[PDB]
Design a binder for this molecule. Structure first.
Ligand SMILES: Nc1ccccc1C(=O)O
Ligand SMILES: Nc1ccccc1C(=O)O
Ligand SMILES: Nc1ccccc1C(=O)O
Ligand SMILES: Nc1ccccc1C(=O)O
Ligand SMILES: [Mg+2]
Ligand SMILES: [Mg+2]
Ligand SMILES: [Mg+2]
Ligand SMILES: [Mg+2]
Lengths: 343, 345
């Protein structure tokens, strides 16, 4: 029976959708069969009717069902993502991009997913990295360099109609959740930042369903990363289940920082901040990077059922600091740049 | 300062808009400055937030400021409308249109707003041979010469085209579905106003209240945007700037309960035939529902005077509506309206 009037009516009636309806809607959007007004009505209605983990999972499933995959056996079983929803309002340095490099340098394979804004892809581009690569070359980068970056428009070309609408309406919706949930390499672990405190649990539910080992993180100051200005909320996903924790990095010797110390402007500035940290500059920015890099490593450790929380953090922090201090992180970036210049 | 992200963000945060924001939005929509996605987002977000009468008033106000007006001093001060939201999802006969003819024949000036839709009011008028395409000047002359005029929504609100398109693309009812009955370009002060959506009728009433109209906003408890004979109706009575909610039972005035299928409509030709049968004096449930709705419009008209009393008003309305059919006045008025249209220019 499925139709726009039926699905929209159910949503405007403040009712959860029936199984399969969110999937039908998203597939319409992804096959160029939904009008801009229909896309917009759906995105808004699905946000104002608080979306469920099942519903958001259906949306992400449809997108992944249409995306370009990586080739068979090119993504190690233990690869990790480090990524956020964005839209925390705060023009920060790209902590996720910095932490990703550090995590890769430490020997954990990283496949990152992202897009232009300031933003993650922009900062990478300004550092000289090729953000643009197709499946076969992203697989090569992962093999040879230890990190890869899937550019969203390259892998999700059928999302362009939905992307054009998000822009036109300019307001956050349920679609802002989809980036971290639709990494086309499908890594099973991640450190995932969520700007929308109310929706982080929903994102966690989605990861739990696919039995990922993920830490979904929201700084109690609003950051879509682990913060050093105060405590963070963590939705810890492992063994298909979610528990909510408060996390205080003071317990690992981290000084309280002020939010303005993690601020960064254009792609050029954030690129300078990356070089500064990877070059060994001390300060609040390094601390944040190390903390979030450790978080990603802890998420990676969680793939093993024998993993323990506090020992995992201590080892993650040691490994993250060493990766920077030895120059490994700095040199991984240099190798990543070199890789892109050599077909 | 005003922008789409600001207004839609406020709405998706479940907040009422600031004074003037809804007006800004509607004006962008009516000037061709809004993308279909923005129109759709706004209509939906406002509906799910729960629109206020201030907000709906602002939307209707912008529309009326862009509409083609009727010439000055051509609409009597006591002219009435008989019109509904539609969207009740039950194909009925054209009760508001039939009632409008009867009310005019009773001597109450009627300027009806309407649209095409099954067969909407405008479709059925066309099938009867009445002109639904007249501009402001000729509608004013219909009113003066025949006692009734019809304002076809698209002809008077051409700048609403972008919004009407989006409404149709998304299908789901929204706050926009309220706007037809609130935006009669002749701006009559009284009306019998149907609302298919029980949860929005009170807000419609509030808008009419703010304008100091004398209106009965009606919702059949069976779902119809008409006063029903099938069961009770909820009526938001608007007079003297204030609204109070009543339940109306036709059994109180001797009407038997009808079944909904007795009121069911068909194509425009079938619905035109149904109008002719009622105006010709056929008894039965359709006549009953027409007389009841014509009476309501006459009660709204009486309400323009603060002297009006509810039960005498309804008894006089019912008398007057019944007599207008029985004397042949209603039938003759329709013939004269058709003739008027055939001899223009
Ligand atoms: N902006 C995007 C994000 C994801 C997929 C496609 C696009 C696109 O622009 O086509
Ligand atoms: N907003 C995002 C965040 C992360 C990855 C992709 C996207 C995207 O725009 O599709
Ligand atoms: N559907 C409407 C509602 C109000 C005013 C005009 C129209 C129209 O279609 O022109
Ligand atoms: N229901 C109406 C009443 C009058 C004018 C237009 C409409 C409309 O919805 O298009
Ligand atoms: Mg991030
Ligand atoms: Mg960030
Ligand atoms: Mg009607
Ligand atoms: Mg009706």
């Amino acid at each position: 029976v499925p139709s726009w009037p039926q699905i929209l009516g159910r949503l405007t009636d403040n009712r959860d959708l029936a199984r399969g309806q969110a999937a039908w809607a998203m597939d319409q959007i992804m096959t160029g069969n939904a009008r801009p007004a229909q896309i917009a009505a759906f995105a808004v209605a699905m946000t104002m009717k608080a979306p469920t983990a099942d519903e958001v999972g259906e949306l992400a499933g449809v997108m992944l069902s249409h995306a370009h995959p990586l080739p068979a056996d090119t993504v190690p079983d233990d690869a990790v993502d480090v990524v956020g929803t964005g839209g925390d309002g705060v023009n920060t340095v790209n902590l996720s991009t910095m932490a990703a490099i550090v995590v890769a340098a430490a020997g954990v394979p990283v496949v990152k997913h992202g897009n232009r804004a300031s933003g993650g892809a922009d900062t990478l581009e300004a550092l000289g990295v090729r953000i643009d690569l197709g499946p076969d070359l992203v697989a090569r980068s992962l093999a040879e360099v230890g990190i890869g970056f899937c550019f969203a428009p390259r892998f999700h070309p059928s999302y362009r109609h939905a992307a054009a609408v998000r822009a036109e309406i300019g307001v956050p919706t349920v679609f802002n959740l989809l980036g971290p949930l639709t990494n086309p390499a499908r890594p099973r672990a991640g450190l995932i930042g969520c700007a929308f405190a109310d929706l982080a649990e929903v994102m966690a539910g989605v990861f739990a369903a696919r039995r990922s080992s993920v830490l979904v993180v929201h700084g109690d100051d609003g950051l879509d990363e682990l913060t050093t200005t105060t405590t963070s909320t963590i939705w810890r996903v492992a063994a298909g289940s979610v528990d909510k924790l408060t996390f205080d990095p003071a317990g690992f010797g981290f000084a309280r920082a002020q939010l303005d110390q993690l601020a960064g402007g254009d792609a050029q500035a954030n690129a300078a901040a990356v070089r500064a940290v990877l070059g060994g500059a001390r300060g609040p920015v390094r601390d944040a990077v190390v903390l979030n890099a450790a978080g990603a490593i802890v998420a990676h450790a969680g793939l093993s059922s024998r993993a323990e929380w506090l020992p995992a953090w201590e080892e993650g922090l040691r490994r993250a600091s060493a990766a920077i201090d030895t120059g490994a992180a700095e040199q991984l970036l240099a190798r990543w740049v070199r890789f892109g210049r050599q077909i």
